[PDB]
Design a binder for this molecule. Structure first.
Ligand SMILES: O=C(NO)c1cccc(O)c1
Ligand SMILES: O=C(NO)c1cccc(O)c1
Ligand SMILES: O=C(NO)c1cccc(O)c1
Ligand SMILES: O=C(NO)c1cccc(O)c1
Ligand SMILES: [Fe+2]
Ligand SMILES: [Fe+2]
Lengths: 332, 332
């Protein structure tokens, strides 16, 4: 339930700006970077919200004006969806499935063009929604590079070492519009999700809920996303979505959410809070050293069987018929 | 339909000595060793009966007296079943499945003891049935070794080379009683089945009928046998056994049946013909050299996935729940 901002300025959000769903949730713990319980959650690959890392301190001033004015006239990838749901897809995997037609889609543009096209949509009710995505690097304007240089690298490098993770594999700046949903998917990397402006609602489900969540086949362009439409679940095809339980929280500026590798996450911008900015940091996990097996490890074995079988068979379409044949009246 | 033996001695068998089954069959071709069509069937891994190889010529005189008198007082593995069906099992795999209790079972004995125990059963209606099994080698009596030395090794070595097979991996002498059934199973090796005395009815199904035939899981002691009881099929659990079509023939003395690797075979001694003797010869196939894929190759891939997954998971019992999870609502 809503958090009270300093200086008597009222609740940060109210529950009328959250969407409704069929399943129960419980809260993710908010803690201090210095609380041993925090380090104990990360260590066990459980999510925690850290409230005082200062990870993105100098980015707290970012808004659209400040960015238009300083980010420099390179081109930026802007994605569009027609409803509130952003459907993403791996273009490389479209060969495999020719009845897949693009749903969301990408435009390039200068930043001010994006801004122009944004404010346009707003004060005309347009149902269109946008997300901007940019890796932070030297290819962006000087002031923004100064801002990026003052992030808490010392905090963020200490975590890389401590956990025995590999190196930062990438990072990504996301700017969104109120109402935006990124539907449930999982990633193979460890993720710190650093909120900068606005509030985001994050629903998480652990690896052992694979069976409730029904990911697309590995060769499908939506590999790692869930087949279940949360807004209208088909209990006939996905009967165990009825048993799903999630973990939830609302992050705001200066909060950092740890999304452990293979954890499902569903991410939405509140209804009517204005725009959101977020930066994610991704690390490869520690490599595998052995029993008895964690859920994430059994997920990787499923992925691998589906990948080998695609190869051995010479064609991704035969994967399903083989698995069924293997089975049917034998293990079911 | 029955074959007429030389010297006006009547039909070899009549159709009243064949058991009834739910499925249709068509005949396996009988041909001469010198018929090019014969070599063309073997070459394509299709079954054929060869009528004049003389493979086991000197064994045609074998019967019980001649064997008791000459086979020498080593010990011989004799198997017993209580019905007509011999259920076989791999003892090594029983750890995995503790609710499996032995059904058929093995006794050692001198040959004359086996003979004694045989004739006993006969003229007292006993429902018990026996099969004797012995590898042919120097460990057996001198005359039988002379007989074995006069087999058509020249024929049998030429086939080994021609097909590009590996070497003879083994051979096996089987002596059976009328009414005996060995239920449907497959082998990974190429098999020449050399009939010596009595008549055997052989029903074969190719590799692509895997889906109709419902083999036990790979870690089960009855790996490679069919779950379907042919005498009373459960169409609810095995619905596609309804679509099974087989190939059939009745082999008699001097006939050689080629059972190609991975072909299901069901083998039964006619009702009331007396005892049967058979010798099988097994070769490893040519190794794999590549598309698009034969049924036997897709069968091997199924076996391998089930074996890897047993290992990766640390326990054979988890194989099924993983495959289902992999698956369910995803590929079905
Ligand atoms: O999938 C995401 N992080 O892993 C993400 C982060 C911010 C906004 C959003 O819509 C999605
Ligand atoms: O939302 C993601 N992971 O949690 C994700 C995955 C791959 C690329 C990417 O840009 C984002
Ligand atoms: O399974 C067999 N050969 O592969 C076989 C051969 C002769 C009799 C018999 O009952 C079985
Ligand atoms: O009947 C068999 N194959 O067709 C078989 C298989 C393994 C051992 C054996 O003695 C016989
Ligand atoms: Fe994500
Ligand atoms: Fe066999």
């Amino acid at each position: 339930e809503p958090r009270e901002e300093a200086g008597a300025l009222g609740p940060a959000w109210d529950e009328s700006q959250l969407r409704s769903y069929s399943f129960p949730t419980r809260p993710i713990p908010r803690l201090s970077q210095s609380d041993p319980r925090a380090e104990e959650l990360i260590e066990n690959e459980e999510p925690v919200v850290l409230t005082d890392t200062n990870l993105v301190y100098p980015a707290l001033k970012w808004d659209l004006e400040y960015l238009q004015e300083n980010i420099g006239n390179g081109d930026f990838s802007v994605y569009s969806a027609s409803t509130h749901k952003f459907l993403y897809y791996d273009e490389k995997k479209m060969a495999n499935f020719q009845n897949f037609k693009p749903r969301s889609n990408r435009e390039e543009m200068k930043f001010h063009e994006f801004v122009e096209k944004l404010q346009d949509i707003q004060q005309r009710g347009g149902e269109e929604r946008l997300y901007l995505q940019q890796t932070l690097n030297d290819t962006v304007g000087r002031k923004i590079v100064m801002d990026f240089l003052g992030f808490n690298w010392n905090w963020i490098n200490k975590q890389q070492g401590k956990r025995g993770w590999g190196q930062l594999t990438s990072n990504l700046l996301l700017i969104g519009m109120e109402g935006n949903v990124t539907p449930a998917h999982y990633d193979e990397q460890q993720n710190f999700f650093a909120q900068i402006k606005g509030y985001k609602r994050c629903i998480l489900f652990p690896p052992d809920q694979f069976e409730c969540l029904y990911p697309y086949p590995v060769h499908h362009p939506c590999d790692r996303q869930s087949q279940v439409d949360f807004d209208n679940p088909d209990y006939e095809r996905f009967p165990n979505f009825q048993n799903v339980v999630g973990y939830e929280t609302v992050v705001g500026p200066g909060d950092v959410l740890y999304i452990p590798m293979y954890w499902w996450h569903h991410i939405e911008s509140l209804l009517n809070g204005g725009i959101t900015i977020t930066v994610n940091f991704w690390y490869k996990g520690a490599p595998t050293p052995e029993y008895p097996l964690k859920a994430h490890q059994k997920v990787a074995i499923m992925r691998n069987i589906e990948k080998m079988l695609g190869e051995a068979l010479g064609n991704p379409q035969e994967v399903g018929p083989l698995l069924n044949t293997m089975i049917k009246g034998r293990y079911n």
